[PDB]
Design a protein around this ligand. Structure first.
Ligand code: ADP
Ligand code: ADP
Ligand code: MG
Ligand code: MG
Lengths: 55, 75, 371, 188, 371, 55
């Protein structure tokens, strides 16, 4: 009875964590790719102004 | 009765001169802010590299543990 | 003490203490009551959000400007705007600070008298002075001559000045300004399918106008080019997605300035009312006015207007005179910078309308010697 | 509808008492499919979905692809002959009727409540559907608290516990003066 | 030969040969695919019933209008509607007849260009011309001045005209019309227990609105009277029995026209957009526009609207001007009668867009001189 | 009992779900903030070029 409830609850519990794990790692990778994009865009005109610093 | 401006002396074309003179100061402060800001923000890329190493190790840990649980459960 | 240089304007209220470079607080002048019912209890919902607060809750408000064309049409809302400006954006009680309002030329007297009566009775300032919005813009340029075209958001006026002596018979005030350009842009956007109707969406159309529109150097060539190629179509993302693409609406919206027949107005454009304002002046100061044409006000910030206007005036003017158009990068706040400079002068310190003087002659003191 | 599609395997529930048994089956077994066609194809080839259930007297029954076909009616009301669009598209229509400046906030704060939104896997299907409908830039977030069933009552308790609300009750003397039509008046 | 005066409209397509008094064939513009499965074999079941045929089989169809607000949102269905109109309701091949479509003001260009491209490529007419729906309604009244409020079923627009010279800067187009009133009536009927949801039952609610609703002369007095007596409750028999009784829903449905805040629209009612449209006109033609206010379109057929509107405008307008509201009994077909008159004129015979002209300039010919 | 060996897991996935939900909510929010900043920088560059457009 309640045993069956426990089995069902535990079995469904494992479902949510594992599926979310892949999404979490994909989010991390996409975040890092975008941050690298911005950093690459950041330093270029930064150095351009460094050259343009007082001409 | 129209407003008759009282007797003054000066000035012209000088306060605008001094106000426009600080353009170099403004450019310097802006460029300093930009440089220090990029320098103090790019470190988050390294912080997210740390995040990536932590996620990689946790993913390896979870793969190992889930294989262990699959081995210990299927009787 | 320090003076408060307020500048009511119509569309953006700009204020700040005298003697600085830029206004301290700049925020739209809109007062919007909520229009829906409201079901959450205790949410702390106010009855009117003014200033920059109503540009964030504009989804459920009905924004309404209290200043139509220079003149003030809704005195209670204007009083609310002033109260907000003094107490929350500057946090200085008005009991200890002189004020320097600004007013467009050729405005109704009752507006100015009511303004001074409010400032002296409700806010109870020590002394206030009202100045014409173009003389200040001439102060900020550091000149002493020149004809200034101050195309604000409410009204465009063109005051010529020589050697400090204003020419009262040559002021040409025209009521086309930024607001009519916003309405015309909102009206021509419907030719592609985008319909903006709500008073909140007028703000979105204003943002489109600010960020995308530009003044064409030659109108017919641009109309021909935009009808063949597609190098002009710039896209823009609404506050919810669904990007839109503006074609030849880009330079047709601000073209209304030079051809007021687009919105049905009879008068001539800002390129020809300046020449007419010059020609009313005396024959010996026309060269100086030609050489020192000054632009000011927000609406003169369109990319490429300082060249179109110069080309037009050079076409109209005699071939020998040199036409030069002064377009400082700080155009938007030019009037307020000039106001700060004027309030910071020592010679001006005795021109304020002191409160005892108002008590003796009533609000009609403003038209008297203390102008 | 579940009681009507169970008849395709042989189980007939007719009595108004057996509607309760079908309700229990629906609560314990049914779930909302993330993608409908793929699930229909999978359930028609393998047999990994067939979950069994014991009636109040024995004679266990096996539910096949009736599991995700019963709650699919929410997103395709054409199954029970209703014309209207599913709960995935009436939310988007309800948003689009709102003003253009509050659509981002409504997109980001979509709230689920009520009992029937407790199906396992609905907070993902609905998000996928709305993300398909909505513009690509907006972020779609679906708030699905674990205490969904009693959400309305918890909110009612919070509202009744407020001090600001204490003067909004319809006092009896007010009803005596205006009759039952007082409810439509200011005291809403 | 004779010209075909078609009038797409939104809700009822009205067509007929030029030179008559009334349209030959008037039928709803709905195209409804069947939605159930269908078990009888050989019954001859078609895939789409259009026009008046789908108002008899509407029990098993899903009717969907191809024109939302003036604009056309589903071009295939509109093409089907036109094909039906030409071949089955008039039985005249379009290869031998000029056509005169009608279009609301301020509509997207692409709609008009696609309309002309369809008429020239698919149906292959000799020549077609597109006219603004308000000028025709002014033709039918036999006037030459006046401001016409053409409150159709899709969109309500208000075009002022003087001495034949239209004023393009004073057109006020509002998107509240008969369809929104049908939806609002269907929404307030739920306050008594009657729920209409299916797209077929929208037709039943439309019939209720047509037969029972009326515009109240004074809104608050009617709301007070309907809440005390029971002299207003009129009953109506559904298509299956179970009569219903409409109480104060009778004058609350069409009241939305004068208070668009009921359906959440911000704008002002049709009583105040007319006054605003007048005030945008010049100061010397306002008396004539006041005296020659014209009503047209279907939705202006509510019993008692020509008095409510006159009372409202008289309240707004200056006390000296005379306010007169022209409400001809043939209001519904006023646009089409005007279209017939215009197509029957000899002076107009050279304004058609001839096919060779379209072949030389493409579909963009419609925006050119041949308007 | 057999109840606890699963109820232990039943409660166990609760904190798992909480951590995953708060983490993913933060991840999407910061990702959107980064995307908005990158869009702002790109628009800044392009429109700064076009506001110049020669003088
Ligand atoms: N960068 C810009 N480009 C184009 N138009 C602008 C720009 N900034 C402001 N405007 C227009 O100018 C108006 C603001 O003018 P402003 O000078 O503030 O008026 P006021 O004289 O009342 O202060 C706005 O309504 C806007 O339409
Ligand atoms: N006798 C009437 N009383 C009230 N409303 C009517 C009446 N006849 C038509 N209507 C409304 O007007 C609409 C028809 O308007 P119509 O003039 O045909 O539009 P269009 O301009 O598209 O032809 C119908 O949808 C109906 O709601
Ligand atoms: Mg100004
Ligand atoms: Mg019509």
């Amino acid at each position: 009875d309640k045993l069956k409830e426990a089995e069902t609850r535990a079995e469904f519990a494992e479902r949510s964590v594992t599926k979310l794990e892949k999404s979490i790692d994909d989010l991390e990778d996409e975040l890092y790719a975008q941050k690298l994009k911005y950093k690459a865009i950041s330093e270029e005109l930064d150095h351009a102004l460094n050259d343009m610093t007082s001409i | 009765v129209p407003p008759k401006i009282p007797d003054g002396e000066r000035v012209d074309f000088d306060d605008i001169h001094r106000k426009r003179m600080k353009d170099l100061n403004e450019l310097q402060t802006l460029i300093e802010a930009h440089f220090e800001n990029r320098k103090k923000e790019e470190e988050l890329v390294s912080l997210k590299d740390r995040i990536e190493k932590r996620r990689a190790e946790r993913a390896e840990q979870q793969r190992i543990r889930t294989e262990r649980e699959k081995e210990r459960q299927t009787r | 003490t320090t003076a408060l240089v307020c500048d009511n304007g119509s569309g953006l209220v700009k204020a700040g203490f005298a003697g600085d470079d830029a206004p301290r607080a700049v925020f739209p002048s809109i007062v919007g009551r909520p229009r829906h019912q409201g079901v959450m209890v205790g949410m702390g919902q106010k009855d009117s959000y003014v200033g920059d607060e109503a540009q964030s809750k504009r989804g459920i408000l009905t924004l309404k400007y209290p200043i139509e064309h220079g003149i003030i049409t809704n005195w209670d809302d204007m009083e609310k705007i002033w109260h907000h400006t003094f107490y929350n954006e500057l946090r200085v009680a008005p009991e200890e600070h002189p004020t320097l309002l600004t007013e467009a030329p050729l405005n109704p007297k009752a507006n100015r008298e009511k303004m001074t009566q409010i400032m002296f009775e409700t806010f109870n300032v020590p002394a206030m002075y009202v100045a014409i919005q173009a003389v200040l813009s001439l102060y900020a340029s550091g000149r002493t001559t020149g004809i200034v075209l101050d195309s604000g958001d409410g009204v465009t006026h063109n005051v010529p000045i020589y050697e400090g002596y204003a020419l009262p018979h040559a002021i040409m005030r025209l009521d086309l300004a930024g607001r009519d350009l916003t309405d015309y842009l909102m009206k021509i956007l419907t030719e592609r399918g985008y319909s903006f109707v709500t008073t909140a969406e007028r703000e979105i159309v204003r943002d489109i106008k600010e960020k995308l529109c530009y003044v064409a150097l030659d109108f017919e060539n641009e109309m021909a080019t935009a009808a063949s190629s597609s190098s002009l179509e710039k896209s823009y993302e609404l506050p919810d997605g669904q990007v839109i693409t503006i074609g030849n609406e880009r330079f047709r919206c601000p073209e209304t300035l030079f051809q007021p027949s687009f919105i049905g107005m009879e008068s001539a454009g800002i390129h020809e009312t300046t020449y007419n304002s010059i020609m009313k002046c005396d024959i010996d100061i026309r060269k100086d006015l030609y050489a020192n044409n000054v632009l000011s006000g927000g609406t003169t910030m369109y990319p490429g207007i300082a060249d179109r206007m110069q080309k037009e005036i050079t076409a109209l003017a005699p071939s020998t005179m040199k036409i030069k158009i002064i377009a400082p990068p700080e155009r938007k706040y030019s009037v307020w910078i000039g106001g700060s400079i004027l309030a910071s002068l020592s010679t001006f310190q005795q021109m304020w309308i002191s409160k005892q003087e108002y008590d003796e002659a009533g609000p009609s003191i403003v038209h008297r010697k203390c102008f």
